[PDB]
PDB file of C-alpha atoms in Angstrom:
ATOM      1  CA  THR A   1     -24.434 -14.701  -1.620  1.00 27.80           C
ATOM      2  CA  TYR A   2     -25.129 -13.099  -4.964  1.00 29.15           C
ATOM      3  CA  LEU A   3     -28.417 -12.011  -3.341  1.00 30.81           C
ATOM      4  CA  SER A   4     -26.301  -9.592  -1.256  1.00 29.88           C
ATOM      5  CA  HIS A   5     -26.097  -7.486  -4.415  1.00 30.19           C
ATOM      6  CA  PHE A   6     -29.898  -6.950  -4.055  1.00 31.24           C
ATOM      7  CA  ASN A   7     -29.455  -5.637  -0.496  1.00 32.36           C
ATOM      8  CA  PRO A   8     -28.445  -1.978  -0.209  1.00 31.55           C
ATOM      9  CA  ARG A   9     -26.789  -2.421   3.238  1.00 31.10           C
ATOM     10  CA  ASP A  10     -24.850  -5.590   2.323  1.00 31.10           C
ATOM     11  CA  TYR A  11     -23.593  -3.716  -0.744  1.00 34.97           C
ATOM     12  CA  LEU A  12     -22.322  -0.820   1.478  1.00 34.82           C
ATOM     13  CA  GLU A  13     -20.650  -3.223   3.940  1.00 33.63           C
ATOM     14  CA  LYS A  14     -18.988  -5.159   1.126  1.00 35.27           C
ATOM     15  CA  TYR A  15     -17.312  -2.218  -0.593  1.00 31.22           C
ATOM     16  CA  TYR A  16     -17.369   1.079   1.339  1.00 31.68           C
ATOM     17  CA  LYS A  17     -15.853   0.319   4.749  1.00 27.56           C
ATOM     18  CA  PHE A  18     -12.608   1.969   3.459  1.00 29.61           C
ATOM     19  CA  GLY A  19     -10.442   0.103   6.064  1.00 31.98           C
ATOM     20  CA  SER A  20      -8.406  -3.107  -1.673  1.00 30.48           C
ATOM     21  CA  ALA A  21      -8.744  -2.627  -5.476  1.00 30.80           C
ATOM     22  CA  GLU A  22     -12.224  -1.150  -4.844  1.00 30.06           C
ATOM     23  CA  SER A  23     -10.965   1.345  -2.249  1.00 26.45           C
ATOM     24  CA  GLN A  24      -8.313   2.574  -4.701  1.00 28.22           C
ATOM     25  CA  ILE A  25     -10.954   2.994  -7.429  1.00 26.61           C
ATOM     26  CA  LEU A  26     -13.119   4.933  -4.916  1.00 22.08           C
ATOM     27  CA  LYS A  27     -10.174   7.264  -4.151  1.00 21.08           C
ATOM     28  CA  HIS A  28      -9.931   7.974  -7.917  1.00 22.08           C
ATOM     29  CA  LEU A  29     -13.699   8.794  -7.968  1.00 23.06           C
ATOM     30  CA  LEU A  30     -13.421  11.004  -4.884  1.00 23.25           C
ATOM     31  CA  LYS A  31     -10.402  12.923  -6.282  1.00 23.43           C
ATOM     32  CA  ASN A  32     -12.175  13.556  -9.488  1.00 22.04           C
ATOM     33  CA  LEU A  33     -15.499  14.631  -7.749  1.00 16.21           C
ATOM     34  CA  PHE A  34     -13.415  17.070  -5.695  1.00 14.33           C
ATOM     35  CA  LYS A  35     -11.836  18.335  -8.923  1.00 16.02           C
ATOM     36  CA  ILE A  36     -15.166  18.758 -10.713  1.00 13.96           C
ATOM     37  CA  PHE A  37     -17.044  20.568  -7.922  1.00 13.40           C
ATOM     38  CA  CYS A  38     -14.220  22.433  -6.209  1.00 16.37           C
ATOM     39  CA  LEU A  39     -11.498  23.178  -8.859  1.00 17.51           C
ATOM     40  CA  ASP A  40     -13.394  23.121 -12.171  1.00 16.47           C
ATOM     41  CA  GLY A  41     -16.214  25.505 -11.337  1.00 20.84           C
ATOM     42  CA  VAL A  42     -19.324  23.268 -11.255  1.00 21.69           C
ATOM     43  CA  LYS A  43     -21.316  25.161  -8.666  1.00 22.07           C
ATOM     44  CA  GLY A  44     -24.864  26.664  -8.347  1.00 19.83           C
ATOM     45  CA  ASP A  45     -27.956  26.577  -6.252  1.00 18.39           C
ATOM     46  CA  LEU A  46     -29.671  23.269  -6.996  1.00 21.22           C
ATOM     47  CA  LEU A  47     -28.188  19.902  -7.809  1.00 23.04           C
ATOM     48  CA  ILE A  48     -30.174  16.757  -8.468  1.00 23.71           C
ATOM     49  CA  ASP A  49     -28.331  13.483  -7.814  1.00 22.53           C
ATOM     50  CA  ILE A  50     -29.713  10.755 -10.073  1.00 20.65           C
ATOM     51  CA  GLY A  51     -29.594   7.091  -8.971  1.00 20.64           C
ATOM     52  CA  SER A  52     -27.991   7.954  -5.609  1.00 19.03           C
ATOM     53  CA  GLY A  53     -28.450   4.403  -4.472  1.00 22.48           C
ATOM     54  CA  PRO A  54     -27.562   3.963  -0.792  1.00 21.65           C
ATOM     55  CA  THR A  55     -24.265   5.978  -1.070  1.00 19.25           C
ATOM     56  CA  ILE A  56     -23.318   9.532  -0.123  1.00 22.16           C
ATOM     57  CA  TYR A  57     -19.661   9.504  -1.336  1.00 23.20           C
ATOM     58  CA  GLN A  58     -20.785  11.254  -4.563  1.00 24.46           C
ATOM     59  CA  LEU A  59     -22.193  14.257  -2.594  1.00 26.16           C
ATOM     60  CA  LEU A  60     -19.360  15.042  -0.125  1.00 26.02           C
ATOM     61  CA  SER A  61     -17.498  17.602  -2.222  1.00 27.68           C
ATOM     62  CA  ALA A  62     -20.664  18.618  -4.127  1.00 26.84           C
ATOM     63  CA  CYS A  63     -22.250  19.905  -0.930  1.00 20.85           C
ATOM     64  CA  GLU A  64     -19.445  22.586  -0.837  1.00 18.28           C
ATOM     65  CA  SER A  65     -20.712  23.898  -4.205  1.00 15.87           C
ATOM     66  CA  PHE A  66     -24.509  23.526  -4.051  1.00 14.62           C
ATOM     67  CA  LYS A  67     -26.796  25.037  -1.466  1.00 10.64           C
ATOM     68  CA  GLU A  68     -29.602  22.403  -2.149  1.00 10.18           C
ATOM     69  CA  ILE A  69     -29.281  18.727  -3.072  1.00 11.69           C
ATOM     70  CA  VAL A  70     -32.136  16.459  -4.206  1.00 10.47           C
ATOM     71  CA  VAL A  71     -31.227  12.702  -3.958  1.00  7.81           C
ATOM     72  CA  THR A  72     -33.176  10.108  -6.010  1.00  7.35           C
ATOM     73  CA  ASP A  73     -33.225   6.404  -6.912  1.00  7.77           C
ATOM     74  CA  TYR A  74     -35.414   3.994  -8.807  1.00  6.49           C
ATOM     75  CA  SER A  75     -35.404   1.644  -5.799  1.00  6.40           C
ATOM     76  CA  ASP A  76     -37.290   2.335  -2.610  1.00  4.84           C
ATOM     77  CA  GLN A  77     -34.906   0.084  -0.734  1.00  4.04           C
ATOM     78  CA  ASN A  78     -31.874   2.137  -1.788  1.00  4.05           C
ATOM     79  CA  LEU A  79     -33.572   5.284  -0.574  1.00  2.00           C
ATOM     80  CA  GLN A  80     -34.554   3.655   2.781  1.00  2.00           C
ATOM     81  CA  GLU A  81     -30.924   2.841   3.390  1.00  2.00           C
ATOM     82  CA  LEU A  82     -29.820   6.336   2.367  1.00  2.00           C
ATOM     83  CA  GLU A  83     -32.438   7.856   4.687  1.00  2.56           C
ATOM     84  CA  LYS A  84     -31.055   5.958   7.708  1.00  2.91           C
ATOM     85  CA  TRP A  85     -27.928   7.999   7.275  1.00  2.00           C
ATOM     86  CA  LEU A  86     -29.637  11.282   6.339  1.00  2.00           C
ATOM     87  CA  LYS A  87     -31.733  11.010   9.542  1.00  2.76           C
ATOM     88  CA  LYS A  88     -28.648  10.150  11.694  1.00  2.98           C
ATOM     89  CA  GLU A  89     -30.067   6.814  12.952  1.00  2.52           C
ATOM     90  CA  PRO A  90     -27.582   4.608  14.894  1.00  3.87           C
ATOM     91  CA  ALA A  91     -28.058   1.567  12.566  1.00  2.00           C
ATOM     92  CA  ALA A  92     -27.008   3.703   9.545  1.00  2.00           C
ATOM     93  CA  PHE A  93     -23.861   2.949   7.563  1.00  2.00           C
ATOM     94  CA  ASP A  94     -20.622   4.316   9.016  1.00  2.00           C
ATOM     95  CA  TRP A  95     -19.330   6.737   6.309  1.00  2.00           C
ATOM     96  CA  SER A  96     -16.781   8.305   8.701  1.00  2.00           C
ATOM     97  CA  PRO A  97     -13.525   6.961   7.052  1.00  2.00           C
ATOM     98  CA  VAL A  98     -14.753   8.144   3.655  1.00  2.00           C
ATOM     99  CA  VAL A  99     -15.842  11.524   5.021  1.00  2.00           C
ATOM    100  CA  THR A 100     -12.384  11.914   6.689  1.00  2.00           C
ATOM    101  CA  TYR A 101     -10.654  11.142   3.340  1.00  2.00           C
ATOM    102  CA  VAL A 102     -12.709  13.792   1.515  1.00  2.00           C
ATOM    103  CA  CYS A 103     -12.085  16.349   4.288  1.00  2.00           C
ATOM    104  CA  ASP A 104      -8.328  15.710   3.794  1.00  2.00           C
ATOM    105  CA  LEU A 105      -8.666  16.101   0.037  1.00  2.00           C
ATOM    106  CA  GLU A 106     -10.270  19.481   0.710  1.00  2.00           C
ATOM    107  CA  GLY A 107      -7.310  20.529   2.909  1.00  2.00           C
ATOM    108  CA  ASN A 108      -9.275  20.046   6.157  1.00  2.00           C
ATOM    109  CA  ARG A 109     -11.153  23.337   5.883  1.00  2.00           C
ATOM    110  CA  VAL A 110     -13.879  21.330   7.646  1.00  2.00           C
ATOM    111  CA  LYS A 111     -13.664  18.342   9.984  1.00  2.00           C
ATOM    112  CA  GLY A 112     -15.782  15.193   9.480  1.00  2.00           C
ATOM    113  CA  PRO A 113     -18.750  16.072  11.787  1.00  2.00           C
ATOM    114  CA  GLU A 114     -19.148  19.491  10.214  1.00  2.00           C
ATOM    115  CA  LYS A 115     -18.980  17.941   6.691  1.00  2.00           C
ATOM    116  CA  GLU A 116     -21.735  15.327   7.603  1.00  2.00           C
ATOM    117  CA  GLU A 117     -23.846  18.156   8.970  1.00  2.00           C
ATOM    118  CA  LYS A 118     -23.410  20.342   5.885  1.00  2.00           C
ATOM    119  CA  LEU A 119     -24.468  17.373   3.648  1.00  2.00           C
ATOM    120  CA  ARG A 120     -27.570  16.516   5.805  1.00  2.00           C
ATOM    121  CA  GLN A 121     -28.658  20.166   5.744  1.00  2.00           C
ATOM    122  CA  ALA A 122     -28.227  20.375   1.915  1.00  2.00           C
ATOM    123  CA  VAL A 123     -30.411  17.294   1.234  1.00  2.00           C
ATOM    124  CA  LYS A 124     -33.838  18.776   0.924  1.00  2.00           C
ATOM    125  CA  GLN A 125     -35.846  16.080  -0.869  1.00  2.00           C
ATOM    126  CA  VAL A 126     -35.563  12.293  -1.370  1.00  2.00           C
ATOM    127  CA  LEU A 127     -37.443  11.223  -4.567  1.00  2.00           C
ATOM    128  CA  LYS A 128     -38.026   8.302  -7.010  1.00  2.00           C
ATOM    129  CA  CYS A 129     -36.323   8.713 -10.385  1.00  2.00           C
ATOM    130  CA  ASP A 130     -36.603   6.738 -13.586  1.00  2.00           C
ATOM    131  CA  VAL A 131     -34.281   7.893 -16.362  1.00  2.00           C
ATOM    132  CA  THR A 132     -36.336   5.898 -18.887  1.00  2.00           C
ATOM    133  CA  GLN A 133     -39.283   8.221 -18.413  1.00  2.00           C
ATOM    134  CA  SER A 134     -39.497  11.491 -20.434  1.00  2.00           C
ATOM    135  CA  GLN A 135     -40.106  13.167 -16.954  1.00  2.00           C
ATOM    136  CA  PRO A 136     -37.558  11.238 -14.883  1.00  2.00           C
ATOM    137  CA  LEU A 137     -38.712  12.630 -11.514  1.00  2.00           C
ATOM    138  CA  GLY A 138     -42.407  12.221 -12.385  1.00  2.00           C
ATOM    139  CA  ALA A 139     -42.877  16.021 -12.762  1.00  2.00           C
ATOM    140  CA  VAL A 140     -42.298  16.871  -9.035  1.00  2.00           C
ATOM    141  CA  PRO A 141     -42.532  20.679  -8.484  1.00  2.00           C
ATOM    142  CA  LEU A 142     -38.785  21.482  -8.725  1.00  2.00           C
ATOM    143  CA  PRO A 143     -37.611  24.442 -10.757  1.00  2.00           C
ATOM    144  CA  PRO A 144     -34.979  23.746 -13.463  1.00  2.00           C
ATOM    145  CA  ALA A 145     -31.749  22.705 -11.696  1.00  2.00           C
ATOM    146  CA  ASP A 146     -28.145  24.054 -11.972  1.00  2.00           C
ATOM    147  CA  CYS A 147     -26.573  20.539 -12.138  1.00  2.00           C
ATOM    148  CA  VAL A 148     -27.666  16.890 -12.529  1.00  2.00           C
ATOM    149  CA  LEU A 149     -25.084  14.325 -11.288  1.00  2.00           C
ATOM    150  CA  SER A 150     -25.286  10.682 -12.639  1.00  2.00           C
ATOM    151  CA  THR A 151     -22.540   8.539 -10.998  1.00  2.00           C
ATOM    152  CA  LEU A 152     -22.376   4.838 -12.012  1.00  2.00           C
ATOM    153  CA  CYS A 153     -26.174   4.327 -12.110  1.00  2.00           C
ATOM    154  CA  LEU A 154     -27.348   4.086 -15.711  1.00  2.00           C
ATOM    155  CA  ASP A 155     -26.041   0.820 -17.198  1.00  2.00           C
ATOM    156  CA  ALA A 156     -28.577  -1.383 -15.381  1.00  2.00           C
ATOM    157  CA  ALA A 157     -31.425   0.704 -16.812  1.00  2.00           C
ATOM    158  CA  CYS A 158     -29.862   1.540 -20.197  1.00  2.00           C
ATOM    159  CA  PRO A 159     -28.656  -1.643 -21.805  1.00  2.00           C
ATOM    160  CA  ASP A 160     -27.443  -0.057 -25.030  1.00  2.00           C
ATOM    161  CA  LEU A 161     -26.157   3.185 -26.533  1.00  2.00           C
ATOM    162  CA  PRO A 162     -29.518   4.537 -27.860  1.00  2.00           C
ATOM    163  CA  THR A 163     -31.195   3.998 -24.491  1.00  2.00           C
ATOM    164  CA  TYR A 164     -28.232   5.618 -22.709  1.00  2.00           C
ATOM    165  CA  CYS A 165     -28.584   8.679 -25.040  1.00  2.00           C
ATOM    166  CA  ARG A 166     -32.366   8.844 -24.412  1.00  2.00           C
ATOM    167  CA  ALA A 167     -31.840   8.754 -20.645  1.00  2.00           C
ATOM    168  CA  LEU A 168     -29.467  11.747 -20.909  1.00  2.00           C
ATOM    169  CA  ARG A 169     -31.987  13.574 -23.058  1.00  2.00           C
ATOM    170  CA  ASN A 170     -34.704  12.836 -20.454  1.00  2.00           C
ATOM    171  CA  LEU A 171     -32.458  14.168 -17.659  1.00  2.00           C
ATOM    172  CA  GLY A 172     -32.072  17.417 -19.651  1.00  2.00           C
ATOM    173  CA  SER A 173     -35.723  18.269 -18.872  1.00  2.00           C
ATOM    174  CA  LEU A 174     -34.531  18.757 -15.281  1.00  2.00           C
ATOM    175  CA  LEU A 175     -31.871  21.351 -16.078  1.00  2.00           C
ATOM    176  CA  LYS A 176     -31.972  25.081 -16.851  1.00  2.00           C
ATOM    177  CA  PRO A 177     -30.430  26.206 -20.116  1.00  2.00           C
ATOM    178  CA  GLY A 178     -26.621  26.173 -19.525  1.00  2.00           C
ATOM    179  CA  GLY A 179     -27.066  23.871 -16.453  1.00  2.00           C
ATOM    180  CA  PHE A 180     -24.300  21.232 -15.901  1.00  2.00           C
ATOM    181  CA  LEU A 181     -24.559  17.467 -16.462  1.00  2.00           C
ATOM    182  CA  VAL A 182     -21.796  15.537 -14.661  1.00  2.00           C
ATOM    183  CA  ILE A 183     -21.578  11.818 -15.654  1.00  2.00           C
ATOM    184  CA  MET A 184     -19.244   9.272 -14.142  1.00  2.00           C
ATOM    185  CA  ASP A 185     -19.428   5.820 -15.728  1.00  2.00           C
ATOM    186  CA  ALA A 186     -17.421   2.761 -16.869  1.00  2.78           C
ATOM    187  CA  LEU A 187     -15.831   2.256 -20.298  1.00  2.00           C
ATOM    188  CA  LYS A 188     -16.758  -1.118 -22.011  1.00  2.00           C
ATOM    189  CA  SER A 189     -18.433  -2.456 -18.849  1.00  2.00           C
ATOM    190  CA  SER A 190     -19.783  -5.925 -18.126  1.00  2.00           C
ATOM    191  CA  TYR A 191     -21.499  -7.379 -15.060  1.00  2.00           C
ATOM    192  CA  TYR A 192     -22.077 -11.066 -14.485  1.00  2.00           C
ATOM    193  CA  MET A 193     -25.742 -11.934 -13.981  1.00  2.38           C
ATOM    194  CA  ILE A 194     -25.758 -15.072 -11.779  1.00  2.55           C
ATOM    195  CA  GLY A 195     -29.474 -15.697 -12.284  1.00  3.05           C
ATOM    196  CA  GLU A 196     -29.377 -15.468 -16.058  1.00  2.74           C
ATOM    197  CA  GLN A 197     -25.844 -17.009 -16.197  1.00  3.33           C
ATOM    198  CA  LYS A 198     -24.443 -14.425 -18.667  1.00  2.00           C
ATOM    199  CA  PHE A 199     -22.559 -11.096 -18.654  1.00  2.50           C
ATOM    200  CA  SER A 200     -24.627  -8.024 -19.492  1.00  4.26           C
ATOM    201  CA  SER A 201     -22.477  -5.426 -21.129  1.00  2.00           C
ATOM    202  CA  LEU A 202     -22.720  -1.771 -22.229  1.00  2.00           C
ATOM    203  CA  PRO A 203     -20.057  -0.797 -24.793  1.00  2.00           C
ATOM    204  CA  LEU A 204     -19.356   2.870 -23.692  1.00  2.00           C
ATOM    205  CA  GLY A 205     -16.159   4.374 -25.160  1.00  2.00           C
ATOM    206  CA  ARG A 206     -15.125   8.048 -25.417  1.00  2.00           C
ATOM    207  CA  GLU A 207     -16.353   8.667 -28.988  1.00  2.00           C
ATOM    208  CA  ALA A 208     -19.686   6.915 -28.393  1.00  2.00           C
ATOM    209  CA  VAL A 209     -20.309   8.620 -25.020  1.00  2.00           C
ATOM    210  CA  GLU A 210     -19.463  12.069 -26.365  1.00  2.71           C
ATOM    211  CA  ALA A 211     -21.734  11.556 -29.319  1.00  2.00           C
ATOM    212  CA  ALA A 212     -24.587  10.367 -26.998  1.00  4.77           C
ATOM    213  CA  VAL A 213     -24.199  13.439 -24.771  1.00  4.67           C
ATOM    214  CA  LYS A 214     -24.113  15.840 -27.768  1.00  9.86           C
ATOM    215  CA  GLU A 215     -27.242  14.207 -29.378  1.00  9.11           C
ATOM    216  CA  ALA A 216     -29.038  14.437 -26.031  1.00  7.27           C
ATOM    217  CA  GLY A 217     -28.765  18.233 -26.320  1.00  8.02           C
ATOM    218  CA  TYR A 218     -25.591  19.096 -24.373  1.00  9.33           C
ATOM    219  CA  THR A 219     -22.214  20.640 -25.209  1.00 10.28           C
ATOM    220  CA  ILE A 220     -19.164  18.871 -23.756  1.00 10.23           C
ATOM    221  CA  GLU A 221     -16.947  20.939 -21.334  1.00 10.50           C
ATOM    222  CA  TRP A 222     -14.512  18.147 -20.451  1.00 13.70           C
ATOM    223  CA  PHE A 223     -14.089  14.364 -20.787  1.00 14.95           C
ATOM    224  CA  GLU A 224     -11.422  12.511 -18.780  1.00 14.93           C
ATOM    225  CA  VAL A 225     -10.501   8.824 -18.169  1.00 15.19           C
ATOM    226  CA  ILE A 226      -9.949   8.641 -14.385  1.00 15.68           C
ATOM    227  CA  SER A 227      -8.892   5.045 -13.664  1.00 13.39           C
ATOM    228  CA  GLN A 228      -7.323   2.021 -15.274  1.00 11.09           C
ATOM    229  CA  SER A 229      -9.160  -1.293 -16.153  1.00 13.13           C
ATOM    230  CA  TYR A 230     -10.684  -3.154 -13.287  1.00 13.75           C
ATOM    231  CA  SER A 231     -11.785  -6.786 -13.020  1.00 13.64           C
ATOM    232  CA  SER A 232     -13.447  -8.655 -10.121  1.00 11.56           C
ATOM    233  CA  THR A 233     -15.254 -12.031 -10.262  1.00 13.14           C
ATOM    234  CA  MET A 234     -18.527 -10.220 -11.002  1.00 13.55           C
ATOM    235  CA  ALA A 235     -17.527  -7.083 -13.055  1.00 14.36           C
ATOM    236  CA  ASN A 236     -15.079  -5.673 -15.668  1.00 14.68           C
ATOM    237  CA  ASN A 237     -14.389  -2.352 -17.315  1.00 16.20           C
ATOM    238  CA  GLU A 238     -11.696  -0.686 -19.240  1.00 14.28           C
ATOM    239  CA  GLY A 239     -11.500   2.235 -16.799  1.00 13.50           C
ATOM    240  CA  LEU A 240     -13.893   4.867 -15.416  1.00 10.69           C
ATOM    241  CA  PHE A 241     -14.481   8.270 -16.983  1.00 12.70           C
ATOM    242  CA  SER A 242     -16.122  11.508 -15.963  1.00 12.47           C
ATOM    243  CA  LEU A 243     -17.640  14.056 -18.337  1.00 11.35           C
ATOM    244  CA  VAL A 244     -18.860  17.489 -17.688  1.00 12.69           C
ATOM    245  CA  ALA A 245     -21.431  18.917 -20.173  1.00 17.13           C
ATOM    246  CA  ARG A 246     -23.745  21.950 -20.353  1.00 17.98           C
ATOM    247  CA  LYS A 247     -27.320  21.798 -21.537  1.00 19.51           C
ATOM    248  CA  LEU A 248     -27.928  23.914 -24.755  1.00 18.77           C
TER     249      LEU A 248
ATOM    250  CA  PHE B   1     -29.860  -4.096  -8.872  1.00 18.71           C
ATOM    251  CA  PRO B   2     -27.625  -6.028  -8.852  1.00 20.45           C
ATOM    252  CA  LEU B   3     -25.400  -3.454  -7.208  1.00 20.80           C
ATOM    253  CA  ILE B   4     -21.991  -4.859  -8.152  1.00 20.47           C
ATOM    254  CA  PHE B   5     -19.120  -2.425  -7.712  1.00 21.21           C
ATOM    255  CA  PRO B   6     -18.463   0.065  -9.349  1.00 24.38           C
ATOM    256  CA  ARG B   7     -22.275   0.334  -9.914  1.00 24.87           C
ATOM    257  CA  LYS B   8     -23.485   2.666  -7.034  1.00 24.23           C
ATOM    258  CA  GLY B   9     -27.281   3.202  -7.624  1.00 23.30           C
ATOM    259  CA  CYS B  10     -30.343   2.748  -9.902  1.00 26.29           C
ATOM    260  CA  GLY B  11     -31.166   5.573 -12.295  1.00 25.37           C
TER     261      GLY B  11
END
């Protein structure tokens, strides 16, 4: 059903079982998250994960580099699903094959159970976010953070370049001067809206994304294209990218 | 929503 895309658990079961084109794209994301947090020096005390949705794959390597992680989403349902796993409930999603993959990428310094435990311990707060708001976390009493991570969670809320830029500028209020912004996102994306019977598209390319980051008050440390074009019946892009930036 | 891969979450 297309309605499955409105259900956080159906979404997990459709794509993340890791047992496919999507699995190969996920390995590209995981290799680059490991590179960012564990080879390229993005480390510190406090990391805020924006638009976490119901997934934890984006935090597995990050929890080696940050003592505290705040996860957030605009949807209560996403966060309910995520909390099933954080609280170790039996009906939670089985992330074990993914966790095992990341432990192997990290050279098996930790085994899966110890990695899951380190992540659950690091997650200190589960909060609503809204990148469209000048105070995206609603002014919760968090001190300025060392990193904000935004993985594949902006295009639904930011339908065009100016709104994308403004969301990045709003996220900057969460970071200390010099604090890292890590974006992962899709170049020239489109997603088929079954209800409205049209694609909705966000034309991100390197030059436009770099400009949006720099006008949102960051300096770019590194941009990289990390996968080739992908096409399913319901989405397209011309590859995924990651970008590491520092707040002014 | 809709969460259609590679979309992961809702900022």
